[PDB]
């Protein structure tokens with residue numbers, strides 16, 4: 001049971017607030033939309049359809065009431081444009097900032113646009129939100145911020161050096177939000193995601209995340225690619241934990257704000273294990289080559305989530321396997 | 337004597353290089369222009385006359401030969417523009433990146449623009465330089481990166497939380513710089529500036545630094561404003577020391593790159609004391625109120641410069657009193 005989360009969502013269905021989801025056509029963004037619309041919440045959406053998709057918002061309209069869908073006001077626009085950020089904040093209570101160009105590799109190959117989106121775009125929104133005096137400001141941060149710190153599990157106080165531009169930007173994000181707290185009193189919540197997967201994560205692109213990429217590959221009957229040895233271990237996190245975390249961070253009390261929280265499950269799964277999980281969770285619905293390490297890529301990842309458990313009462317209920325089983329059917333429909 | 341510097345300055349007079357000075361129309365930039373042009377160097381300059389001044393360039397040309405000046409290719413442009421950044425690098429050997437927006441209060445009032453220039457504009461220079469495969473990359477960093485860390489003097493490995501948007505932007509320059517070494521092999525040198533004063537530091541504007549502000553007001557007879565009790569202390573660093581620092585960094589060995597150095601003298605001077613010095617050095621050329629602290633204000637500042645001494649062979653030869661003596665006549669002249 002996601003106890004506190006449930007309570008917090010009851011509050012929401014009672015006093016609906018106006019939410020801003022930057023990156024709303026994205027994987028996490030669109031999921032927050034689906035949840036938030038079902039919570040009878042008025043959602044202002046912002047997205048420029050870079051990695052995001054019409055077919056995500058389109059999908060969400062499939063899954064919410066007509067009455068609920070009319071509470072959604074989509075805006076096509078750019079967090080890089082400050083004005084846009086100011087337009088969208090009007091009347092907003094809670095800001096769920098999810099818009100960025102993730103991918104460690106992308107950042108290495110184009111750190112310039114990455115910077116514009118992940119830093120400029122982040123600061124623009126952060127500032128627009130402050131000036132609007134929104135009630136909450138929760139932003140997507142990243143577990144790559146840990147960088148080269150050797151310790152496991154990964155605890156918040158304990159970050160090392162960044163290994164990619166992408167890490168820099170997300171670390172920069174975290175830095176600004178502290179400065180905005182210290183100098184403006186604008187208390188925010190950073191969410192250090194660890195490899196979120198689930199419904200609407202893009203299986204296509206050179207920058208596809210492991211889980212969808214490999215799923216797509218098995219469904220086409222193509223080769224499944226393993227970068228390095230395969231023992232590269234990760235804390236995979238089903239979207240519902242992320243959705244949970246955002247909402248809990250939106251309505252966190254003041255004393256738990258100006259804080260970064262690992263969003264994961266505390267589990268550690270290597271790529272050799274995962275490939276097994278996916279194959280097994282896919283063959284239940286009726287249907288491999290090793291290469292060199294990705295550069296900039298962190299070696300091991302396992303989240304310590306006790307902070308979220310303690311301060312926000314986050315209960316990560318869905319582990320990797322349970323989440324994969326919840327995820328496959330969506331990919332089957334999306335790729336048939 | 338500034339011995340290694342003497343040696344390196346000669347090395348230039350004989351085999352001059354192409355330098356890029358970003359923020360060449362400004363305090364540190366124009367001084368670097370003057371030193372490099374006097375050394376017969378080829379210099380591409382970049383500046384958008386935001387805080388910089390045409391009068392600064394106008395002054396420099398007065399101080400150098402017409403043939404020395406004809407080796408200055410000034411380009412009016414913004415560093416936020418990636419294209420311009422790439423253009424100016426054509427044929428550059430050494431990059432002296434000083435193009436940024438200082439002033440902690442400026443960033444508190446407008447973090448967006450400070451970000452734009454100091455992070456976006458920096459990354460553009462760094463990225464363009466890396467792609468131009470320039471010989472040296474030296475950027476102006478800041479003692480404000482030390483943030484809340486209580487150490488004194490301030491050594492380079494020991495930093496705390498940034499206390500302002502400005503402090504962030506500068507920290508991020510170092511962080512970007514490191515990542516670039518790690519991921520591209522592009523080794524840079526970051527110069528942590530501690531309160532640089534001297535010829536051509538702007539005495540006007542709301543964001544005038546203390547010395548030109550107080551000197552401007554002691555020649556007008558204006559009230560001298562002290563922010564705080566008066567015991568707030570700085571490591572005041574005359575320009576020549578910075579210039580030494582920038583040239584030493586440019587022709588430093590590979591082993592001494594991907595490194596950050598404090599630029600200062602190593603001395604500690606309080607505002608109560610500074611005020612005494614400025615008065616005494618101005619009355620040697622023939623001519624006070626207390627208020628509350630600056631927010632984002634670091635209380636004490638002093639550099640440990642021993643790293644720079646060991647690795648670059650730096651010699652902080654000009655202390656605060658001697659520096660003021662060389663600065664004053666300029667301010668007398670620039671204002672009369």
Ligand SMILES: NC(=O)c1ccc[n+]([C@@H]2O[C@H](COP(=O)([O-])OP(=O)(O)OC[C@H]3O[C@@H](n4cnc5c(N)ncnc54)[C@H](O)[C@@H]3O)[C@@H](O)[C@H]2O)c1
Pocket residue numbers: 022023024025026027028029046047048049050051052053077078079080097098099100101102103117121140141142143192193194195196197209
């Ligand atoms: N993939 C992960 O599990 C993970 C891990 C750590 C951090 N993050 C960060 O959290 C968010 C991840 O969300 P996702 O996995 O759904 O990513 P995603 O690829 O679905 O993209 C998120 C959305 O941001 C939008 N966007 C990008 N740039 C924009 C801009 N300039 N203006 C407006 N919208 C823009 C995209 O179009 C997309 O709709 C990103 O901010 C990412 O950097 C993700």
Ligand SMILES: NC(=O)c1ccc[n+]([C@@H]2O[C@H](COP(=O)([O-])OP(=O)(O)OC[C@H]3O[C@@H](n4cnc5c(N)ncnc54)[C@H](O)[C@@H]3O)[C@@H](O)[C@H]2O)c1
Pocket residue numbers: 358359360361362363364365382383384385386387388389413414415416433434435436437438453457476477478479529530531532533537538545
């Ligand atoms: N002197 C100090 O007290 C001090 C202390 C710490 C750091 N610094 C750093 O030294 C560098 C310059 O300092 P300064 O004292 O010469 O200040 P300055 O204002 O004299 O110089 C800044 C120069 O940057 C140029 N510039 C600003 N934005 C630009 C842009 N977008 N594109 C191109 N040019 C742009 C301005 O025209 C100006 O000439 C900056 O990195 C500053 O943060 C100075």
Ligand SMILES: CC(=O)C[C@H]1[C@@H](OP(=O)(O)OP(=O)(O)OC[C@H]2O[C@@H](n3ccc(=O)[nH]c3=O)[C@H](O)[C@@H]2O)O[C@H](CO)[C@H](O)[C@@H]1O
Pocket residue numbers: 102103104141142143144145166192193194195196208209210211213214224225226227228232234271294297298300301
């Ligand atoms: C530990 C982190 O830094 C995790 C952050 C980081 O997520 P990540 O670990 O890069 O996710 P990925 O699914 O992309 O890679 C899976 C692994 O298998 C490798 N990989 C990938 C694809 C493939 O087909 N085969 C493969 O072996 C791949 O090189 C890697 O070794 O970037 C995310 C958003 O950009 C987010 O910040 C995460 O928190």
Ligand SMILES: CC(=O)C[C@H]1[C@@H](OP(=O)(O)OP(=O)(O)OC[C@H]2O[C@@H](n3ccc(=O)[nH]c3=O)[C@H](O)[C@@H]2O)O[C@H](CO)[C@H](O)[C@@H]1O
Pocket residue numbers: 437438439440478479480529530531544545546547549561562563564568570607629630633634636637
């Ligand atoms: C330790 C740092 O933070 C150093 C960075 C940081 O330098 P700084 O110390 O803010 O600059 P200043 O010379 O302006 O203030 C000196 C003292 O005079 C006091 N001050 C100032 C003006 C005045 O009228 N009266 C007064 O008392 C004021 O309260 C303050 O206590 O900002 C610089 C601007 O780019 C630069 O980046 C430095 O590296």
Ligand code: NA
Pocket residue numbers: 134135136185186187
């Ligand atoms: Na708040």
